[PDB]
Amino acid sequence: EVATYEDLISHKHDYPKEIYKESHYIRRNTRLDVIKKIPQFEQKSKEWLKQRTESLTATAISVVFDEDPYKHPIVILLDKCGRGLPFVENKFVHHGNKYEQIGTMFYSFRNNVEVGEYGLLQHSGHKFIAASPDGICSKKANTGGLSKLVGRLLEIKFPFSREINNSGDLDGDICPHYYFLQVQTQLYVTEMDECDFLQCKIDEYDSWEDFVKDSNPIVPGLSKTTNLEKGCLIQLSDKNLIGSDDKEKCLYNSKYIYPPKLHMTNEEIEKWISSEIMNYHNNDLSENYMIDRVIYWRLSQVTCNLIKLNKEAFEEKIPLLQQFWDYVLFYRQHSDKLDKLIKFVEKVKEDNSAEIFSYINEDFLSLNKDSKYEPLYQEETEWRKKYNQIKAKKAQM
């Protein structure tokens, strides 16, 4: 049974020796140390911004493949040329950005491994391919020494309304296809083998009293209703949006202070919250954000499915990405042709990818006589068909 919280720590992945013996553990560990020491620049500023303009992110890969249900490839090309829509904050990103770190903490504790986060990483061979993994498991086991999970990527998703499918295809049902391709790109860029896809559902208590009432008697960190971890959060509101009737916009721009660890006793929580408040006027966040309220949460559902890298299947599609990127670099040096392109895309709408990229390919070949490039998206992909089938089902009601 579970006497203390230490019995919840899985030791299935502990490594017996003090030095890796198997080839794949050695390679994954060495690769991880090479991923470390890679220069990562101060976020939101200077060369960090430069890094994003020279590469496609992993979220764009599913769209350039004409296999995304929400966006079409032209949106990515225009976005990378500086003529894209500004981003409006919504409820989905808010929920995911709010609890992502809680997922990381749960995974690190239950699987007994340290998880580090790293910024945008570019592929050594194809610098225009970049990814930002949520975390990569280090060699260090939280309790003992080494872990068999070294170099395993971690992807945490907190679906706002979508319900987690437990069985079916891994590429379609259990993991949505657009996320699956994102994981594949992250694995290719990091040069790692496997990634744990973690999907979680969370619900929130009404007050501090309900939080204390749900505590397991001797293991306070567990919930009595869901038998999973629970804890606290400090929500901070934006000073620029604090005084408005548009409250959703204020909520979606909130920042959060996260607890130091899981399975804190109630006194440890109270001491932590008091410490954050009593020293908040010395927190840089105090210049732009104000203390709103305390959030009380408990985990309700956690699924974890392993995703492995299919190297050849990804490298078969690299010529497509190289061609698309050549179009991006093309319209970055010809502003006039870009203006005419935007006119044409407004003429024939976004979803008609065949005619759009036929025009783009002819525009490209006009200044590249010897180019062997042929137009893209001449046929709809099968995932494009499947998504169009779903759109047709929805539009009938």
Place this chain on the structure above:
Amino acid sequence: ATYEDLISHKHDYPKEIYKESHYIRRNTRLDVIKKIPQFEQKSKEWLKQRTESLTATAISVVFDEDPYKHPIVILLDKCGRGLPFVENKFVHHGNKYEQIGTMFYSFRNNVEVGEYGLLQHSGHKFIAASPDGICSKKANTGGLSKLVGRLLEIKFPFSREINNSGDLDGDICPHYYFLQVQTQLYVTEMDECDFLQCKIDEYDSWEDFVKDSNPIVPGLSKTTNLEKGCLIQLSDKNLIGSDDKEKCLYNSKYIYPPKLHMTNEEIEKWISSEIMNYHNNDLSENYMIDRVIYWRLSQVTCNLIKLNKEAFEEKIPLLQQFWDYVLFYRQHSDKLDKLIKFVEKVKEDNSAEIFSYINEDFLSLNKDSKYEPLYQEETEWRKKYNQIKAKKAQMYK
């Protein structure tokens, strides 16, 4: 040596029932005040009470004995043609720490202090006062108190320095405050008032706060040998994020600690509890949690002021005349407009001509009245204030 040695028992009453006449009268009078109906402040009949009476702060001005305002300002204020009040640093400072003064007095003098709203004299309903507090019969350590019915007046001067010796009517207690206390004693029908003046400075952080704790009496400061504690500052949602930060600061509200000499654990527990349940505090609807303030008492003086009943009742006919002028211009709007025009012709400080004109306006519709013009000669305090203004305004020396 613990904090219990700071509690004075000089004012404890030995018997379980008051024997002396003045204790009996003050106790009975106080119990009569507790049953006086007090209406919801800032709303409904509260506003009605303010229109029917002169507050105690206006009395020093109506006597032509105030250094800041002149008598005409009160008449125009009571008729609805006065300036709006702009919040400033002095009122902010006093309203910020008044409660801390009350707590210090209650602790050191071993008496419970109750607060009561605006009270009218019943004999002269147009005379009203709102005392900061009145000491009840109950001693904190059990039993009766000799301080029953004693008024409490707390002043936290921002820049004015506290004079320790000299005249009570001029030096120790500023004359305008003295007249305010006299009116409060007359309205409540009590005998004595403790005039408390306090100076405060604030620590930079919680670490400095704990370092300044006296070794053997932790609730006392080591540098100033007086009490120290905490406050929770709350900012207005409507003025937060504004370009005027001073205006936002002066409109802040505060949550006060339950007691003095709290241990560090008790402070941390109090702050954590106040934060976690702030969404169940009605103040959260309009105010948000700003920061924690750490304060220590640096100087405290206390001087007893007794009521001069005859000296106050000599000035009641003047107040009745002034109020008759107010009620007069409340039913004759046209004469009020012409009056404001006349006050623009000659300035506010020329009380003689203004109230000579007012007396002529009054007698025009009240032929028999026996009223004579007011402020025809300058009072002795008016002379002294003009002397000080002249000293400041001179070019040489």
